[PDB]
Amino acid sequence: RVDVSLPGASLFSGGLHPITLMERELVEIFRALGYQAVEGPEVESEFFNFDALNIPEHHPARDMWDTFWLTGEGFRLEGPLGEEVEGRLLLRTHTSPMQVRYMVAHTPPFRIVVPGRVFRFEQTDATHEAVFHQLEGLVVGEGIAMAHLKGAIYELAQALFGPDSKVRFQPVYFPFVEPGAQFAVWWPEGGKWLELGGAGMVHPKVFQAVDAYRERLGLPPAYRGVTGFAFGLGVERLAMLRYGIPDIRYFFGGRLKFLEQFKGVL
Amino acid sequence: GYQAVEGPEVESEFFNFDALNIPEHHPARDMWDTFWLTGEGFRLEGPLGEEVEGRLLLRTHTSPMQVRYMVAHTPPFRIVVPGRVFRFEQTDATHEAVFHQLEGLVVGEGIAMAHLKGAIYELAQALFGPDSKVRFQPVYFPFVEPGAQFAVWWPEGGKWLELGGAGMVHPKVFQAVDAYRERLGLPPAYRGVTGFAFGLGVERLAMLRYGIPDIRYFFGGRLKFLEQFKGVL
Amino acid sequence: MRVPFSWLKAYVPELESPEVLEERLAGLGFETDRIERVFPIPRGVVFARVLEAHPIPGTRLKRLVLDAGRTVEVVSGAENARKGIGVALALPGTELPGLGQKVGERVIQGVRSFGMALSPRELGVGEYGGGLLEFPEDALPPGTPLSEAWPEEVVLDLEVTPNRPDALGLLGLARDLHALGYALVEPEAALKAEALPLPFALKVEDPEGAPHFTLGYAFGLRVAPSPLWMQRALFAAGMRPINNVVDVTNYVMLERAQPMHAFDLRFVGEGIAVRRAREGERLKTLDGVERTLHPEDLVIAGWRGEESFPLGLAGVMGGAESEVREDTEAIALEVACFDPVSIRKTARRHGLRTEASHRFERGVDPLGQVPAQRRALSLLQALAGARVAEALLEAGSPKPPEAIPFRPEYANRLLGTSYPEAEQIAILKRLGCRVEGEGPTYRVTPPSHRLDLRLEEDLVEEVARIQGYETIPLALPAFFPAPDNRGVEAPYRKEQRLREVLSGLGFQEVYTYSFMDPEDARRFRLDPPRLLLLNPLAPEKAALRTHLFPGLVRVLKENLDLDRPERALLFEVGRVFREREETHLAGLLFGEGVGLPWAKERLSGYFLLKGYLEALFARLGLAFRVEAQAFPFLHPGVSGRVLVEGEEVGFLGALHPEIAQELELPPVHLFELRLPLPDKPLAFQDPSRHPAAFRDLAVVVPAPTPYGEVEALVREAAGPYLESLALFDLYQGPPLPEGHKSLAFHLRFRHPKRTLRDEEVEEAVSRVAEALRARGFGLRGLDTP
Numbered sequence A: 001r002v003d004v005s006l007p008g009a010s011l012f013s014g015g016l017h018p019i020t021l022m023e024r025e026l027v028e029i030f031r032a033l034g035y036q037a038v039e040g041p042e043v044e045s046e047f048f049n050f051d052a053l054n055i056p057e058h059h060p061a062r063d064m065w066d067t068f069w070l071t072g073e074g075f076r077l078e079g080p081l082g083e084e085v086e087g088r089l090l091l092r093t094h095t096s097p098m099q100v101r102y103m104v105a106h107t108p109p110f111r112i113v114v115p116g117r118v119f120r121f122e123q124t125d126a127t128h129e130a131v132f133h134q135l136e137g138l139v140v141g142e143g144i145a146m147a148h149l150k151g152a153i154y155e156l157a158q159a160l161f162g163p164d165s166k167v168r169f170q171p172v173y174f175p176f177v178e179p180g181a182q183f184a185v186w187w188p189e190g191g192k193w194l195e196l197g198g199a200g201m202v203h204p205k206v207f208q209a210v211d212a213y214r215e216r217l218g219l220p221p222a223y224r225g226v227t228g229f230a231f232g233l234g235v236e237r238l239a240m241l242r243y244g245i246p247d248i249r250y251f252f253g254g255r256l257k258f259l260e261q262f263k264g265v266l
Numbered sequence B: 001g002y003q004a005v006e007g008p009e010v011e012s013e014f015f016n017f018d019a020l021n022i023p024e025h026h027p028a029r030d031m032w033d034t035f036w037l038t039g040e041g042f043r044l045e046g047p048l049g050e051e052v053e054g055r056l057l058l059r060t061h062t063s064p065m066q067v068r069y070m071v072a073h074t075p076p077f078r079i080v081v082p083g084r085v086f087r088f089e090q091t092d093a094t095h096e097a098v099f100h101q102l103e104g105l106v107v108g109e110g111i112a113m114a115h116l117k118g119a120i121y122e123l124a125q126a127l128f129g130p131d132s133k134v135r136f137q138p139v140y141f142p143f144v145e146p147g148a149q150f151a152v153w154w155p156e157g158g159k160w161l162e163l164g165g166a167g168m169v170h171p172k173v174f175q176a177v178d179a180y181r182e183r184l185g186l187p188p189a190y191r192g193v194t195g196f197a198f199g200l201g202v203e204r205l206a207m208l209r210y211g212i213p214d215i216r217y218f219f220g221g222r223l224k225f226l227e228q229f230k231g232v233l
Numbered sequence C: 001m002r003v004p005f006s007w008l009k010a011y012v013p014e015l016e017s018p019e020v021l022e023e024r025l026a027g028l029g030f031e032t033d034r035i036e037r038v039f040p041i042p043r044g045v046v047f048a049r050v051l052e053a054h055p056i057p058g059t060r061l062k063r064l065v066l067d068a069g070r071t072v073e074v075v076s077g078a079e080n081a082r083k084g085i086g087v088a089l090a091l092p093g094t095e096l097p098g099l100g101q102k103v104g105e106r107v108i109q110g111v112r113s114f115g116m117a118l119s120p121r122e123l124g125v126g127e128y129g130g131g132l133l134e135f136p137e138d139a140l141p142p143g144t145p146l147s148e149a150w151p152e153e154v155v156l157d158l159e160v161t162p163n164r165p166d167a168l169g170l171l172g173l174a175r176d177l178h179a180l181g182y183a184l185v186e187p188e189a190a191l192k193a194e195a196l197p198l199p200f201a202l203k204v205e206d207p208e209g210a211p212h213f214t215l216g217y218a219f220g221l222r223v224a225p226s227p228l229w230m231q232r233a234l235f236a237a238g239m240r241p242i243n244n245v246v247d248v249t250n251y252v253m254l255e256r257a258q259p260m261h262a263f264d265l266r267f268v269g270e271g272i273a274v275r276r277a278r279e280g281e282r283l284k285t286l287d288g289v290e291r292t293l294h295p296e297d298l299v300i301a302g303w304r305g306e307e308s309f310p311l312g313l314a315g316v317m318g319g320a321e322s323e324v325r326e327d328t329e330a331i332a333l334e335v336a337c338f339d340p341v342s343i344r345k346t347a348r349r350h351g352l353r354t355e356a357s358h359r360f361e362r363g364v365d366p367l368g369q370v371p372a373q374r375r376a377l378s379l380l381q382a383l384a385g386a387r388v389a390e391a392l393l394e395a396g397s398p399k400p401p402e403a404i405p406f407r408p409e410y411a412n413r414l415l416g417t418s419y420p421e422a423e424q425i426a427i428l429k430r431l432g433c434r435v436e437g438e439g440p441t442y443r444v445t446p447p448s449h450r451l452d453l454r455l456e457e458d459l460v461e462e463v464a465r466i467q468g469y470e471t472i473p474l475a476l477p478a479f480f481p482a483p484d485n486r487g488v489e490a491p492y493r494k495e496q497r498l499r500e501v502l503s504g505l506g507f508q509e510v511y512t513y514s515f516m517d518p519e520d521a522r523r524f525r526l527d528p529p530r531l532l533l534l535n536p537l538a539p540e541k542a543a544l545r546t547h548l549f550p551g552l553v554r555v556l557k558e559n560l561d562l563d564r565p566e567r568a569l570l571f572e573v574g575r576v577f578r579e580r581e582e583t584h585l586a587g588l589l590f591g592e593g594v595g596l597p598w599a600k601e602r603l604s605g606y607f608l609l610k611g612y613l614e615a616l617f618a619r620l621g622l623a624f625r626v627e628a629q630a631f632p633f634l635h636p637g638v639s640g641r642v643l644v645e646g647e648e649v650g651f652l653g654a655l656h657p658e659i660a661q662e663l664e665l666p667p668v669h670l671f672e673l674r675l676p677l678p679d680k681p682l683a684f685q686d687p688s689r690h691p692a693a694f695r696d697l698a699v700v701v702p703a704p705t706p707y708g709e710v711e712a713l714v715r716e717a718a719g720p721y722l723e724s725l726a727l728f729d730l731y732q733g734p735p736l737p738e739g740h741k742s743l744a745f746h747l748r749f750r751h752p753k754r755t756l757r758d759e760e761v762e763e764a765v766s767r768v769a770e771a772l773r774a775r776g777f778g779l780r781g782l783d784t785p
């Protein structure tokens, strides 16, 4: 007789990292709102990471980001249009630079979301990492207003936490947006406001940088009569409170006993 | 912004014909070659899980699902319902009795034909590129007015492809929806709205996009045919 | 509908060309399937007058003496060659399109035939070949070439949708083109009537099936062949000319989508009676077929004293007896509106489809009757020199169309356009509507021939098609969806990931028809189908599938015969019908299996399929288990039920050998489940940072005892600190007490907050050992490092 309850041949079964699951969940949410996902380089130049985004040398703002500087000969960093871009190299402290790289190479209107790994020089603890992930969006076009920004984040809240979810915006400062704001979502099941990220209307000086640089490369300017908004958020923060991960250090810890738990999550 | 919802393959004449303004002994009924069904002890349930009574049939189009959706949800919304449909026909190299359609429906305050032309425009751009253009012409459907047929300029094939139909939902379709909602105790929701709908054949695209010569391959189940599409994502 | 170019051009005199006309019609909503060119008549074909026709003794042939400029003679066996008519003579040397051969002078029964008189078919102007073309004796000067009176024609084959029955008449199409800006030349009814009583009467016995009926009176008729212009027009229209009067009735029908019929008074009697047919009443319709009228067939009947006889099938076909022939001198002209439904049923019933029924089903201008009478009568007078009575007999009084409210603002609001008020109302007016009011909401009343214009939307489509759909701008909508539509796609998404996970593992997708052979319910041993078709494509497709697997199994065989696969692993997700319509998932494994190609050792069959399934289930993150149970279609020795998350959702096993044998298949393993599978949320369990404790143990169990039962026992007893439990060896033989087997297990105990004391593991492995023996099991080994 054949025992049907006997274990069958042991083929392997895979799984995806908590962060990939979460990242995927956020990209599809925005895809439904017409946003396309584009990625950028991890090793950036100070120009795209700081200068173009209105964050200059010896300025209080520069203190908000703890940069890892890089040294290395014979490394080719190439700009938006495949040109050799010259600057002091660094590991990106945010995904924002990619938004300048996109604008110089494309013409408005458009809506983009750029997920990515970012680095900050910090002491890694249960809620702090030096290597983590962010997701930033950018919508540029004639007539884009703050109302449209509040609308997008509203749709984000509704999608992550339900119809009974509500967003809240308050003023905050960022060198690359004005007005600027921080947004929080009412997580109804947790009965508390969660601070998710920042956002604001692209700063006049960011568009000038884009065009000025476009002109340098021979491209006609495209950001003269447009407005636009941008927001950015941390992925780990969501991933933790959504999957219930207590220690941010698990993400890069590579323990199979941790990762395997997320096999069932699609 | 469209969400995909599916519907049943075995339908009742009410949802498949009557609610969609296609009545008994009417020229329009001739456009669809229906497979009628007989069978005791089969439970067909309506939108709200109610036992729906009617003469059973295999759906001739996905449109009925659009009435089922409207009775159970309130506007505004945008939906796309892919599905298998049946028609009594003699199966040849370009004709099948069992095939698939995909229909959409957008309902809300202020939805106009311009928005319909815009959607199909976006469809053309996505399937065939920036150098793609759509064309609309008048045609008749009992469930839309204005009504139209649309074709896409397939630049690489250098010819206009007739893709499907579309139009603005007919006044009588909304009345059917509400009247039926009222019957089930739901308040009416389609009084001051407008809406557009379109529907298209999948096989037609699939063939001209993957280069499949015979529509009969689809249900032919030959491994030597299916395996060729392993690389397509 | 064949729309002959030169004919349509008689109403819309300014048409650019057929190519442009086709483009024009496309935008108005009518698509042409094709554009044919039609009357290529050779110069060798001339017009000849038949002076006399002499029969050739002992033959059925005749010697026609023709005035063809010069007097020639032609032999012919045509049933209608007779003196006093014009014929189309093909002079010797003429190459004919129709008969594809060359015409020559030839000897036929003692007479030398100079060419040959032609039939509609031989000339190539029509399919009919049972007789000579008959032209009026004086149509043309004997000898003058036909081409000169019969020029080529371009004919467009239009698709005319059900909503526009008025387009089943050339004037109807002409009025649309008129709205675009073309000039309309409407024909005038030049009548010279005379006041005198009608020699018959009308009695409409069913005003429900004949809401408007009218009869006209024409007498002093001289029936003859039609003028060449009317013959050319009819042939192009796809119709064959008969004679003077019958042709007028076909010409006016096409002209205005109003069928009409002339009855020879001789057969009418005292009058016409529109009534239903009486049981068993018969009628020999024009086609020659003697039919048997059904009590629901509307009939035009004539009566005499107290007798009522069927004269024709109302609005479908006329009787062959009263048909207008040569000796007919006075007729009664039928011109009416019948109920579509009635005509429809009768037409289907008798398997008839005529130009008349076709237009009556779609509908006819409820008030076009009278005008049609004047037109036909007028032509009869002109063509057959008829004397026409002034009065018409009319039954019925249809109410004119009702007014529709029109808001230009709303038109624009619905289209998303901004056509100015004035410009919109002028469209409506060009189309024939009467617009009342000053705005903003007008009272627009449609013409009687536009049966499709009833609602305001109908009117907005008119503004759109005349302005052009091209003029509607592009745009995208922006709105927040109403709350209940949120999350509405979770289901579709869940099933689509399932398919993706399946193809990822290695399963190949298959699509199979929803139909099932009823006999299969037998071959596979299943309950019979619940839904069967009343009109199946074929007997083997007469039912709706209750299971998925039968079909997979068939495509498997079909594959083996066509190509000889060494293996296959398929899967299908699809609807299944039984009590309720439900979605199923089913797969099948067959063939050699997995292993090194250049080696013989292979993984296959039941435990391989069960592997792909356990693998599949870990990915979906669900608990999967198989308990043995019998299934009619499965193999008794390899048959079990699938338990997902604790519930029975389907089976898994080897195909029953007998079914295998009957179908000539090798063994096959398969499974079938009912979707949607349970959904299990994420409960994160922070893993212990402390070392596990290992331990091995074997259980001696009587051979029949299921591995699953043992596993459950060891597990339930191992305690809250058991982390992993695995089977590494299955042995049964010496010196194991015969009829027994041993199950080797690797166990792992782990304490979350701290490391375990040996006494904890020990004491714990004792709870297992205890309950293990209390069930009657022995311990072949335990506490092995």
Ligand SMILES: [Mg+2]
Pocket (backbone or CB within 6 Å): B145, C163, C452, C458, C461
């Ligand atoms: Mg219409």
